[PDB]
Write a protein that binds this ligand. Structure first.
Ligand SMILES: *[C@@H]1O[C@H](CO)[C@@H](O[C@@H]2O[C@H](CO)[C@@H](O)[C@H](O)[C@H]2NC(C)=O)[C@H](O)[C@H]1NC(C)=O
Ligand SMILES: C[C@H](C[C@@H](Cc1ccc(-c2ccccc2)cc1)NC(=O)CCC(=O)O)C(=O)O
Ligand SMILES: *[C@@H]1O[C@H](CO)[C@@H](O)[C@H](O)[C@H]1NC(C)=O
Ligand SMILES: *[C@@H]1O[C@H](CO)[C@@H](O)[C@H](O)[C@H]1NC(C)=O
Ligand SMILES: *[C@@H]1O[C@H](CO)[C@@H](O)[C@H](O)[C@H]1NC(C)=O
Ligand SMILES: [Zn+2]
Length: 696
């Protein structure tokens, strides 16, 4: 009763090679499941994290290189445009010959970079307003500095778009870095040195004189301004409640409540909104509804922005854009980022040009590249198998509801209604393959020059920003996919109450119609469970069946949810990560993902037990003396065989909403009585604590 097919041998070999059978499963299941992978692998110089999951993404890039690198006579225009974009990206000799010239030509259109400009005040100061400077970077280039103004889905009215106002992102990974001491010192030093190195290159190319102490002074001031901005931003812990974050107001109300004084000029919110909205010919009045996500930040900004000049502000705003463009210029510019990249990621070199380029074209032409990907790598017939697995997991979730003692009957019924209403999206939208003309029309406005990579990326920025802004007066497209197909991930959209499983994730170790079902349920079954559970986590549960931010919970049901979920906050908050210098995980910021992981594991294992009931035991895998209940957990854990560079661990512990792979494995299995029974774990062994956190 042993499976001896080619497919079973490959599954068995992989499972055998990754594990360390000398480790006791109940002492450390991560080391038992992944110890062999850990002993055999070294993190590549270009990777900040490496493991089975990242390897899948590296392998998908290989497919993208194969389908983009060679022209074919049959190629439709949309495909021709993707391949021409790819060719401009990989031509490093044309890029190197242009030096920094494409940036120099762009600099006047953003009101220049004072430090790299002679007589800046004379040249731009006359026509400089914060309203115009912030809006220019936003509307034309998608660069959001000081004030993040965007068009997006209305949380309380999923069918429409609204303008949002939020705090902007920082140059460094999180606000924590701006402390600039201990584990953050190297990154702060590399960041300012990076500003200076770029200012020095620009000044050298423009043939301007260079005073080293003045470069140091000016860029240290950019850092002091940004440290004040960072300290004014709300921590992620204070942005986890979508009810508290949502503050709908009119432009009139914003002008009263959140006034600002910049360079001795009173900030006009109406002027700023119109400076952006005019780009796609939309006029705005004080009657326009605006969602303010950061009212506290706008309040703290008022005393900060009065202390700095037009010069100091433009030095930061322009740097925040330049930072991102330096990698698209000649080797000299690319080199200037080396220490900064090493401090944030630990990587000693940049990823292969073709990989960055395949990823860049995938990101900007997700439908054209998605089409090329699915034709080369995806079954399509497998879409139906995943459709069934989704139905089995959705059913289990609905069944689990009645077995929840902490939720009342009314909240159980409403949760069932939302669970029933979840729309699924599997593999790819059929249209990208079957409707060549719709695909050609999507990229109509794009015209790439094969020798002008920088101009192509600039065109992409304007196109992306114009497309998002013109959505304001439009209804949200129901058919629209929230992700391209050539993606190794899955998603949940709270606004559409939809789960998305791109072709990229529908492959081993997650899914194969040719691998054991114990592996399918432990892999993609668990991923399906994770995405459904996102509709019911600390964020998703605040959204209804139609995707609206509305409370469908009774006070006692909500209170009991918070109590059950507080266990996971403490459980994961107590994990200490050696690679991150002994720092604790943020149990609050990782809560949504930990609820989803714990919820998903339960639903997939129960759906797999239901499968064994209906179809009986599966044939055993050779060379593995484990049953299929054990193989389910083994596959589940092997998704996360991998490790992190310590620089990247410091980064991700602050920026990632997911717990690191090892803790997702340890954490979920510690809470699983089902795991402990499969591996016969003694009570209070590391993998089997007495207290187990449960929510779904
Ligand atoms: C680590 O786990 C402990 C135990 O669950 C957590 O301790 C609780 O902390 C809160 C807030 O300080 C107290 O009100 C509780 O009384 C504590 N409970 C116990 C049993 O001591 C602790 O918060 C967790 N640490 C992190 C960083 O999450
Ligand atoms: C958008 C994101 C998608 C999610 C898909 C997923 C969900 C759970 C598991 C998994 C399997 C076995 C054990 C535990 C968990 C694997 C994949 N991706 C990540 O979680 C990491 C991606 C990354 O690192 O970029 C989300 O929904 O959070
Ligand atoms: C790179 O661009 C230069 C200048 O246009 C051109 O001479 C060269 O052929 C290009 N290389 C490739 C491989 O396309
Ligand atoms: C950070 O912000 C708070 C609140 O606005 C302020 O009181 C404090 O002085 C700031 N700290 C630093 C280091 O800038
Ligand atoms: C914004 O204000 C400036 C003067 O402060 C003005 O020249 C410009 O036309 C205004 N833009 C819009 C769209 O109102
Ligand atoms: Zn998730």
């Amino acid at each position: 009763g042993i499976c001896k097919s080619s497919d079973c041998i490959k599954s068995a070999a992989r499972l055998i090679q990754n594990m360390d059978a000398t480790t006791e499963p109940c002492t450390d299941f991560f080391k038992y499941a992944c110890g062999g992978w850990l002993k055999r692998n070294v993190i590549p110089e270009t990777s900040s994290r490496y493991g089975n999951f990242d390897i899948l993404r590296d392998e998908l890039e290989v497919v993208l290189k194969d389908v983009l690198q060679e022209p074919k006579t049959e190629d439709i225009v949309a495909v021709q445009k993707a391949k021409a974009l790819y060719r401009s990206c990989i031509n490093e000799s044309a890029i190197d010959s242009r030096g920094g010239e494409p940036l120099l030509k762009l600099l006047p259109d953003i009101y220049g970079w004072p430090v790299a400009t002679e007589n800046w005040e004379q040249k731009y100061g006359a026509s400089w307003t914060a309203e115009k400077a912030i809006a220019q970077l936003n509307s034309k280039y998608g660069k959001k500095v000081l004030i993040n103004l965007f068009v997006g889905t209305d949380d309380k009215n999923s069918v429409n778009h609204v303008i949002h106002i939020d705090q902007p992102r920082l140059g460094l990974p999180s606000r924590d870095y701006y402390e600039c001491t201990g584990i953050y010192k190297e990154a702060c030093t590399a960041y300012v040195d990076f500003m200076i190195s770029v200012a020095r290159l620009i000044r050298q190319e423009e043939r301007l004189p260079i005073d080293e102490n003045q470069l140091a002074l000016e860029m240290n001031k950019v850092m002091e301004l940004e440290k004040e901005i960072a300290n004014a931003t709300a921590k992620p812990e204070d942005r986890n409640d979508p009810m508290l974050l949502y503050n709908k107001m009119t432009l009139a109300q914003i002008q009263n409540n959140f006034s600002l004084e910049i360079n001795g000029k009173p900030f006009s919110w109406l002027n700023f909104t119109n400076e952006i909205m005019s780009t796609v010919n939309i006029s705005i009045t004080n009657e326009e509804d605006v969602v303010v996500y950061a009212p506290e930040y706008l309040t703290k900004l008022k005393p900060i922005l009065t202390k700095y000049s037009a010069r100091d502000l433009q030095n930061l705003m322009s740097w925040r854009f330049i930072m991102d463009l330096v990698s698209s210029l000649s080797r000299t510019y690319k080199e200037s980022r080396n220490a900064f990249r090493k401090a944030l990621y630990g990587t000693t070199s940049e990823t292969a040009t073709w990989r960055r380029c395949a990823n860049y074209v995938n990101g900007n032409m997700e439908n054209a590249v998605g089409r090329l990907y699915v034709e080369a790598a995806f079954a399509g017939e497998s879409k139906h198998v995943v459709e069934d697995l989704i139905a089995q997991i959705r059913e289990v979730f609905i069944q689990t509801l009645d077995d929840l003692t902490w939720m009342d009957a009314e909240t159980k019924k409403r949760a069932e209604e939302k669970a029933l209403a979840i729309k699924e999206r599997i593999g790819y939208p059929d249209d990208i393959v079957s409707n060549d003309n719709k695909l050609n029309n999507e990229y109509l406005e794009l015209n790439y020059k094969e020798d002008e990579y920088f101009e192509n990326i600039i065109q992409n920025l304007k196109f992306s920003q114009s497309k998002q802004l013109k959505k304001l007066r439009e209804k949200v497209d129901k058919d629209e996919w929230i992700s391209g197909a050539a993606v190794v991930n899955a998603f949940y959209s709270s606004g559409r109450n939809q789960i998305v499983f791109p072709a990229g994730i529908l492959q081993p170790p997650f899914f194969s119609a040719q691998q054991s079902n114990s592996l399918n349920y432990g892999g993609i079954g668990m991923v399906i469970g994770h995405e459904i559970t996102h509709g019911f986590d600390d964020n998703g549960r605040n959204f209804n069946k139609d995707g609206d931010l509305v409370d469908w919970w009774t006070q006692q049901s909500a209170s009991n949810f918070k109590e059950q979920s507080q266990c996971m906050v403490y459980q994961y908050g107590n994990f200490s990560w050696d690679l991150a210098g002994g720092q604790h995980l943020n149990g609050i910021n990782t809560l949504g993902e930990n609820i989803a992981d714990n919820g998903g594991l339960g639903q997939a294992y129960r759906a797999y037990q239901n499968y064994i009931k209906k179809n009986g035991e599966e044939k055993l895998l050779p060379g593995l003396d484990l049953n299929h209940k054990q193989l389910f957990f083994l596959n589940f854990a092997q998704v996360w065989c991998g490790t992190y560079r310590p620089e990247y661990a410091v980064n991700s512990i602050k920026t990632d909403v997911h717990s690191p792979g090892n803790f997702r494995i340890i954490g979920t299995l510690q809470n699983s009585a089902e795991f402990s029974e499969a591996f016969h774990c003694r009570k209070n062994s590391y993998m089997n604590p007495e207290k187990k956190c449960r929510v779904w």
